């Protein structure tokens, strides 16, 4: 004698913030599913993040461009945050080329079909000279979790180009996750509960797809776990 | 006695790791013992982890 949870209304308060509710939860599984989902969501959500950057006139992270105010290292740190949605391919090379006085935000990147820049207002740099012009190529990969600069060296594969600027990859779009189990009194039933999962992300994964993917991964692990071949 | 000299400056980026020493302004000290995934850490009712 059991019930099953069906995905019911999925409200989006902001572009980043979403509330996903699961209404027909039997007593006791509110917390179990809340916690399992929270864990998988925070740990395993596949996302995209900037992996490397090539700017022309800069040999190493510590030097400086003429006519800009942020250091190369700070520009890298700003690029780390760039939230980008690639649909089909895994590795995209975006090219940003802008000149003149003005704040160069992420919107100025040359817009390719498969790439969607979620927040065009994200600042990158501030120019200060009429003739100051910066060109660069940002290579963005797909990945899950967190891989630092120093680990990626294992797969070097002839990293010879000194122009290549490695950035630590934060491959994770989910920023925050909380769940609230509240009694979902349906007019003909005694003790049933609703799970309300409130999730805040950088605006890449849609809530439904996140929850579905988490449930998938948990289901696969439980498949492997249930069978016991002694 | 020295014909010539070459000086080379290396810039190493050192990340926090287990075994570094951390302190407060009031005399409280300690060694970083373990780095846990975000999930394991206690979290507030609101969901922000410590």
Swiss-Prot record, chain A:
GO biological process: bacterial-type flagellum assembly; bacterial-type flagellum-dependent cell motility; cell motility; cellular response to cell envelope stress; DNA-templated transcription initiation; intracellular iron ion homeostasis; nitrate assimilation; regulation of DNA-templated transcription elongation
Enzyme Commission code(s) on record: 2.7.7.6
Post-translational modification: (Microbial infection) ADP-ribosylated on both alpha subunits by the phage T4 protein ModA. ADP-ribosylated on only one of the alpha subunits by the phage T4 protein Alt.
Catalysed reactions, as listed in the record: RNA(n) + a ribonucleoside 5'-triphosphate = RNA(n+1) + diphosphate
Known outcome of mutating residue 159 to K: 5-fold decrease in CRP-class II promoter-dependent transcription
Region Alpha N-terminal domain (alpha-NTD), residue ranges: 1-229
GO MF entries: DNA binding; DNA-directed RNA polymerase activity; protein dimerization activity
Domain of life (superkingdom): Bacteria
GO cellular component: cytoplasm; cytosol; cytosolic DNA-directed RNA polymerase complex; membrane; transcription elongation factor complex
Domain notes: The N-terminal domain is essential for RNAP assembly and basal transcription, whereas the C-terminal domain is involved in interaction with transcriptional regulators (such as CRP) and with upstream promoter elements.
The protein's name in its UniProt record: DNA-directed RNA polymerase subunit alpha
Positions spanned in the full protein: 7 to 236 of 329
From Swiss-Prot, chain B:
Post-translational modification: Acetylated on several lysine residues in the presence of glucose.
Use in biotech settings: Co-administration of salinamide and rifampicin or salinamide and myxopyronin suppresses the emergence of resistance to both antibiotics.
Record-annotated disulphide pairs: none
Family from the record: Belongs to the RNA polymerase beta chain family.
Function: DNA-dependent RNA polymerase (RNAP) catalyzes the transcription of DNA into RNA using the four ribonucleoside triphosphates as substrates. Resistance to the antibiotics salinamide A, salinamide B, rifampicin, streptolydigin, CBR703, myxopyronin, and lipiarmycin can result from mutations in this protein.
Subunit relationships: The RNAP catalytic core consists of 2 alpha, 1 beta, 1 beta' and 1 omega subunit. When a sigma factor is associated with the core the holoenzyme is formed, which can initiate transcription. The rRNA transcription and antitermination complex (rrnTAC) consists of RNAP, NusA, NusB, NusE (rpsJ), NusG, SubB, ribosomal protein S4, DNA and precursor rRNA; S4 is more flexible than other subunits. In pull-down experiments interacts with CedA.
Stated name of the protein: DNA-directed RNA polymerase subunit beta
Provenance organism: Escherichia coli (strain K12)
Phylogenetic lineage: Bacteria, Pseudomonadati, Pseudomonadota, Gammaproteobacteria, Enterobacterales
Gene: rpoB
Whole-protein coverage range: 1045 to 1094 of 1342
């Amino acid at each position: 004698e059991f019930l099953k949870p069906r995905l019911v209304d999925i409200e989006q308060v902001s572009s980043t913030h979403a509330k996903v509710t699961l209404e027909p939860l039997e007593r006791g599984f509110g917390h179990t599913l809340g916690n399992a989902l929270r864990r998988i969501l925070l740990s395993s959500m596949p996302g995209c993040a900037v992996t490397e950057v090539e700017i022309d006139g800069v040999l190493h992270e510590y030097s400086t461009k003429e006519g800009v105010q942020e250091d190369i290292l700070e520009i890298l740190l700003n690029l780390k945050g760039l939230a980008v949605r690639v649909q089909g391919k895994d590795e995209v090379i975006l090219t940003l080329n802008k000149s003149g006085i003005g704040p160069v935000t992420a919107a100025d990147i040359t817009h390719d079909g498969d790439v969607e820049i979620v927040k065009p207002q994200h600042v990158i740099c501030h120019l200060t000279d009429e003739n100051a012009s910066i060109s660069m190529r940002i290579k963005v990969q797909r990945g899950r979790g967190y891989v630092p600069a120093s680990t990626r060296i294992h797969s070097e594969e002839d990293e010879r180009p000194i122009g290549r600027l490695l950035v630590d990859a934060c491959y994770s779009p989910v920023e925050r996750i909380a769940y609230n189990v509240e009694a979902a009194r349906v007019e003909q039933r005694t003790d049933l509960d609703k799970l309300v999962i409130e999730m805040e992300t950088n605006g890449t994964i849609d809530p439904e797809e996140a929850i579905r993917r988490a449930a998938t991964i948990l289901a696969e692990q439980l498949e492997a776990f249930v069978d016991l071949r002694d | 006695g020295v014909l010539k000299i070459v000086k080379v400056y290396l810039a190493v980026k050192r990340r926090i790791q287990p075994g570094d020493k951390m302190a407060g302004r009031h005399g409280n000290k300690g060694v970083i013992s373990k780095i846990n995934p975000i999930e394991d850490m206690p979290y507030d009712e609101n969901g922000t982890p410590v």
